Structure 1
Amino acid sequence: XXXXXXXXXXXXXXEEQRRKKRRLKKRIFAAVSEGCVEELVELLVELQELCRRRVPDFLMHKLTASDTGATCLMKALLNINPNTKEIVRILLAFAEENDILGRFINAEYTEEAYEGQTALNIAIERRQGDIAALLIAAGADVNAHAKGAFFNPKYQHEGFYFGETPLALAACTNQPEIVQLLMEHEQTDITSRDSRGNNILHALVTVAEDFKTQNDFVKRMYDMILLRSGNWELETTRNNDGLTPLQLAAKMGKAEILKYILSREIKEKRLRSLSRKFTDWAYGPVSSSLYDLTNVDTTTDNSVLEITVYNTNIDNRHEMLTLEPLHTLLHMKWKKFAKHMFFLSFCFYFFYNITLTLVSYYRGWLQLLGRMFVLIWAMCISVKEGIAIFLLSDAWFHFVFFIQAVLVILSVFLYLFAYKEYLACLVLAMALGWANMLYYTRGFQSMGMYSVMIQKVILHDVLKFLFVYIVFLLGFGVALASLIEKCPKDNKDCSSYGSFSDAVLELFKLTIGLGDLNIQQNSKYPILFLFLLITYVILTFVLLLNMLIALMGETVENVSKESERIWRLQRARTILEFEKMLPEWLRSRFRMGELCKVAEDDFRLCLRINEVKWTEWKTHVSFLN
């Protein structure tokens, strides 16, 4: 993004009292920029003090540029010089000699996109730590926020976000030692929060890249910071949206850092009070270990699982899922109730569709008896589908179920009244029904991944082929109809293509191979007709070959691999939907939580799982000696 302008060496635009004033001020700024002839700065400072001697507010105004609110020290810090430390010392000494130092160093850069900015921000972004400690020691407020536009962007591509504090900036950026200095300082605040309210930790999450980079600053800095300040009062806090930093890292597709946040095994006493993933009884490869689930068991307001699974703007959900508590929870919930209810609804729907088929085939008293309850199932499934359909590449099947039951109830209704078209609607219904059998191939891996591939092909690859095919079809169709304008001469069979749609249909038969390529009869110029038709055949062939080419390249190496992952995701989505489907009291009966006493005064929910890693253990054994 391109926008309003900043301090730069090169301006983009192409009595002697006023002239002397301009010379002196601009020379001050230019000496700050070059930062070389500090004797020039000394003479200019002596002259400014002499002018003031022959008032401090006007002095600071002559020093502080009113255009962007930029001061000489800020410009000096921007233009990084070898002596720039010396220049900062000199200017600081002169400001002390003037004694307007408070309002000076507390200057907020005044601009539209920059409502506020300390010089310390620049000291840190520029990586000067010695100067940072000096200005901090000088009496610098380390708590003011860069509540601006460039710092708080709407989109990540346009703008730089770090946390709107010095400390968050030191953390996001490399500089750790400065973090130690700021933590040591007494007037420092950690629990201060930005405009959105995201604290330091939330800010850290907004920056850690995924993809398992070899060296990551955020994975370590978070650990150090949390180890220093021992508090559950830090991660318990929330942003504007009421989101925990855990939940925030989950919303975004941030993997390895999330893995860390969910397993913090640490030995010291207060650390143990802070720890997560409490371990016991480990013995060679085998190990029991228990986790905690205070915001993870799906009972919370906006739990972790609902955020991982119902979020489609990531595509990294599968990686997140393979973590311990999540995967174990899904497996447990499956084995407890999904393996029941899934087959249950499968059998209901199967009986339903068979009944529909038989009732459609024969168009007695027991026939009416079944036909009654079929309307009940139709109405029930329609009511269940509509709520999710109105409230919203996965939910297509829901719309399809809703369409089916809608059509069935409509057909039954028009049979209740005096209508003839009803049978038509009816049969279309049951046809759609059998397509929805694909919905239940999720029950099995071998059929499920196949159905996933089928749906992917039907959505991605065929439409581009079919659109261009139909436009060629229509163009050739009108062409050939124009050639076939010769009247039938008392025999419509002599005019095979007298109708446009008839010619279309024959071309489709041709593309299959059923038809009869007639020598052009009832045609004025038959050879042109024939050449044209041949051309159509050729273009269909090459178009087909092109989609067939383009198909193989999408399947480089990730066909089966993405298929299995997507199957697992689909199972997760269904399992969690059923988990919401149950009552509250049944969920009380299924709440898998186990308590624990890790602290003197902490009694939290927990999940005990066993882990068996022959391979990692054998590596551990081999490397140990």
Structure 2
Amino acid sequence: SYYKGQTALHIAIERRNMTLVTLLVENGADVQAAANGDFFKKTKGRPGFYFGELPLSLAACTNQLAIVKFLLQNSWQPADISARDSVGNTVLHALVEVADNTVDNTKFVTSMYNEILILGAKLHPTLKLEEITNRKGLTPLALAASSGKIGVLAYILQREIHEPECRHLSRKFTEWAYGPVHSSLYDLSCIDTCEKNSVLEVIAYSSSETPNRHDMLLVEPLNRLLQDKWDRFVKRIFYFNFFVYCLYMIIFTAAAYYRPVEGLPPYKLKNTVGDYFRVTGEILSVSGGVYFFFRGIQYFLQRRPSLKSLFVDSYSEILFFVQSLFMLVSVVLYFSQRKEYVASMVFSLAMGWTNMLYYTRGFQQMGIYAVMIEKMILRDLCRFMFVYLVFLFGFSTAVVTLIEDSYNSLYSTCLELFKFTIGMGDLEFTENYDFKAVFIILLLAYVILTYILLLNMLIALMGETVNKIAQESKNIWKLQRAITILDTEKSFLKCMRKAFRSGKLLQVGFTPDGKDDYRWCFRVDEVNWTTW
């Protein structure tokens, strides 16, 4: 369990003993066998350090490049690089999981990663090690993208090896240096329409736990790729969707405004042009409601977000789904001869208009207002509700109790006190209650405590949030644009087929196996003239 498979070779490794590892692997110890334990497993419930399961993986993670280079080439018992553990981390994946974005750690892990890839290329030209998906089903590229490791991902995105024998693994090819512009040719390997965990998907679909999601899309290839996707086809599809939604909301508003007032539903169709227009508008409205219901169900089934992180990452989808629910309840009440249907429909009307702020996320300068509204409704107001309600209820019950012998009921007292809290009430002291002085004291304390002291506290916190997320306009709207691009591409399969997302699918080299490979790529010209 704890000490399952661990031997003196690991202890020599972690202590940096050059000769002990050589002696042990000369003795014939089977480095294929893996050591696992509670301390090794990535469990928060127990203390431990994760270094994979393969002993070669531990040697690599523990900063020993010559030692692992010998282990691999040790004729007595070479270690297999392609070993995949039950936990689901390969040696390369183990290195990815070790990294913590630090500059020195970035340099260390990148150097050892490049060295180990070169060694593997020397070892097994026939096999490509990178693409083998690990136990969880995501390759080291996808794992680095999803986990948050910007340092490990940046190099892999612009992984260029100047050795002419390693050109079949380099990701970035420098086409020429005609000037400060340096033409590029990335591999776009499994970035778009590839597999379960594409790089863009894991970057964007992530549950926001990752700590540097915004900075990931600043890498050299991702920015150009997303901008190309936006300009090519996505932009006009989004604008068409916005226009169709505006028409839908206008039709819904016109249909609901001119609803019949005499009788109970359903309402018999009368022979008039206006009646035909009204009924067709109602049919279109209900059709849109059904569409949004099904799109919400499809989204929730696809992503299946966790209950805790449901609202944080799916605010707009939640709101569209709730609007669809309201309209469906309205139609259900319509055919049950209940006049209450209207009361539901208006909630789907008022809501339907405000949901249009979703589309402001498709513009740069106007896109932050939706973000601010979402954050100020989920973070500040939500948890200030609890702080306010103890005050409201305490003083409401106290006032009602004091004068039992507009403040007659508990509902009206709560409403009047809430009006006081927003500076919208009248202090009169006109009626001759019992204990008038105590009533005046209670109301003045409430007004000073909630109107002057708590309301302004809430406003200060809201201003802090607005201030904080108003600096980061570029990052915020870039991420929102990326998410909408992903959703637009994924919604219409024919759209993905006709996207021409990649620049081209050309074979720009010959593999050491002897067969030239056709790889996807796109141009990325970057200007750097100061460095000459």
Unaligned runs of 5+ in 2: 260-273, 305-311
Name 1:203's counterpart in structure 2. 94
CA contact under 8 A between 2:182 and 2:525: conserved in structure 1?
A: yes
Aligned counterparts of 1:584 and 1:434: Cα–Cα separation in 2: 30
| Residue-by-residue CA offset, 1:187-232 (whole Å, 9 max, x unaligned) | 2122333333532111111101114447642111111111122145
1:505 to 403, 415, 432: 415
The amino acid across from 2:85 in the alignment is D
For residue 470 of structure 2, the aligned residue among 545, 550, 560 is 560
Give matches, 1:500-539, under 5 Å: 500-519=410-429, 521-539=431-449
2:44 aligns with 155
Q: Structure 1 CA distance, aligned partners of 2:96 and 2:328?
A: 51
Per the alignment, residue 4 of structure 2 pairs with 115
Say which of 318, 321, 329 aligns to 1:399.
318
Shift of 1:598: 0.7
Instruction: State the alpha-carbon separation in 2 of the partners of residues 567 and 549 from structure 1.
Output: 25
Aligned counterparts of 1:293 and 1:608: Cα–Cα separation in 2: 8
Distance in structure 1 (CA, Å) of the matches to 2:438 and 2:247? 57
In 1, the alpha carbon distance for the partners of 2:495 and 2:342 equals: 44
| Alignment CA distance shift 1:475-1:574 (3 Å) | same
> Aligned in 2, Cα 1:335/1:589: closer, same or farther, shift over 3 Å?
closer
Kept after mapping to 1: 8 A contact 2:39/2:46: no
**Is the Cα contact below 8 Å between 1:318 and 1:565 reproduced in 2?**
yes
Q: Determine the structure 2 residue equivalent to 1:81.
A: none
Name the counterpart of 1:188: 78
Contact 1:484–1:522 (Cα < 8 Å) also in 2? no
Q: Is residue 244 of structure 2 the alignment partner of residue 348 of structure 1?
A: yes
Bigger mean CA offset, 132-141 vs 535-544: 132-141
Contact 2:154 2:219 in 1 (8 A): yes
Deviation at 1:440, TM superposition (A): 0.9
Report Cα offsets for 1:579-607 as digits up to 9, x if no partner.
11112485156353331231152222322
Partner of 2:519: 605
- Structure 1 position 145, deviation (Å): 1.7
Work out the CA distance in 1 between the residues paired with 2:256 and 2:494. Answer: 40
Residue number in structure 1 paired with 2:352: 433
CA shift digits 1:79-130 (9 cap, x unpaired): xxxxxxxxxxxxxxxxxxxxxxxxxxxxxxxxx3111211111111122212
CA distance in structure 1 between the aligned counterparts of 2:247 and 2:438, rounded to whole angstroms: 57
Q: 1:357 to 1:588 in 2, by over 3 A?
A: closer
The answer on 1:617 being equivalent to 2:529 is yes
Evaluate the alpha carbon distance shift between residue 387 and residue 610 of structure 1 in structure 2; reply closer, same or farther with a 3 A threshold. closer
Contact residue 520 and residue 526 of structure 1 kept, 8 A: no
Could you tell me which of 150, 156, 168 is aligned with 1:273? 168
Residue 386 of structure 2 is matched in structure 1 by 467
Q: Check the 8 A contact 1:287/1:612 in 2, yes or no.
A: yes
Q: Are residues 220 and 578 of structure 1, via their aligned partners in 2, closer, same or farther at CA, if it must alter by over 3 Å?
A: same
- Match of residue 595 from structure 1: 506
Question: Take 1:185 and 1:476, find their aligned partners in 2: how far apart are those partners?
Answer: 80
Which residue of structure 2 lines up, in the alignment, with residue 443 of structure 1?
362
Matched, 1:547 2:458: yes
Q: Percent identity?
A: 46
> 3-state SS of the aligned residue for 2:387?
helix
- Contact conserved, 2:372 with 2:466, CA < 8 A, in 1? no
Calculate the aligned-residue CA RMSD, in Å: 2.4
Say if 2:118 is the partner of 1:227. Answer: yes
* Cα shift at 1:133: 2.4
Q: Distance in 2 between matches of 1:368 and 1:165?
A: 69
1:419 alignment partner in structure 2: 338
Of residues 300, 305, 319 in structure 1, which corresponds to 2:215?
A: 319
Q: How much does 1:517 deviate? A: 1.3
Give the Cα separation in 2 of the matches to 1:309 and 1:514: 44
* Higher deviation after alignment, 275-284 or 540-549: 540-549
- Corresponding residue number in structure 2 for 1:310: 205
- How many aligned positions are there? 497
In 2, Cα distance between the equivalents of 1:589 and 1:545?
Answer: 51
User: Following TM superposition, by how much is the alpha carbon of 1:267 offset from its aligned partner in structure 2, in angstroms?
Assistant: 2.9
Greater RCO (CA < 8 Å, at least 6 residues apart)? 2
CA shift at 1:577, angstroms?
Answer: 0.9
Q: Quick check: 172-181 or 440-449, which moved more?
A: 172-181
Aligned pair partner of 2:193 in 294, 298, 303 = 298
Contact 1:147 1:195 (8 Å CA) reproduced: no
Question: What secondary structure does 1:192 align onto?
Answer: coil
Give, in whole Å, the separation in 1 of the partners of 2:362 and 2:119.
49
Deviation at 1:301, TM superposition (A): 3.6
Q: Tell me, what secondary structure is at the counterpart of 1:446?
A: coil
User: In the alignment, is the contact (CA less than 8 A) between 1:118 and 1:144 conserved in 2?
Assistant: no
Deviation at 1:413, TM superposition (A): 4.0
* 1:606 aligned partner, one-letter code: W
2:395 to 476, 480, 487: 476
Alignment of 1:348-367 (within 5 A): 348-363=244-259, 364=274, 365-367=276-278
Cα distance between partner residues in 2 of 1:120 and 1:233 = 29
Instruction: Say if 2:315 and 2:374, in contact at 8 Å, map to a contact too.
Output: no
* Residue ranges of structure 1 left out of the alignment (5+ in a row): 1-111, 487-495
Q: Which moved more, 1:175-184 or 1:569-578?
A: 175-184
| Residues 584 and 515 of structure 1: CA distance in aligned 2, closer, same or farther (over 3 Å) | closer
Q: Which moved more, 1:435-444 or 1:323-332?
A: 323-332
Aligned-pair CA distance for 1:355: 2.1
2:35–2:55 Cα contact (<8 Å) kept: no
2:287 to 371, 376, 383: 376
Q: Closer, same or farther in 2 for the Cα pair 1:217/1:164, shift >3 Å?
A: same
Residue in structure 1 matched with residue 307 of structure 2 by the alignment: none
Say if 2:298 is the partner of 1:387: yes
- Note closer, same or farther for the CA distance 1:124–1:418 as it changes in structure 2 (3 Å cut): same
Q: Deviations over 1:498-557 (max 9, x none)?
A: 11211222222223333321215241110011011111111112122333444555577x
User: Which of the two has higher C-alpha Rg?
Assistant: 1
Alignment check: 8 A CA contact 1:280 1:287 kept: yes
Q: Is the contact between residue 338 and residue 578 of structure 1 (CA under 8 Å) also seen in structure 2?
A: yes
Moved more, 435-444 or 300-309: 300-309
Equivalent-residue separation in structure 2 for 1:300 and 1:238 (angstroms) = 10
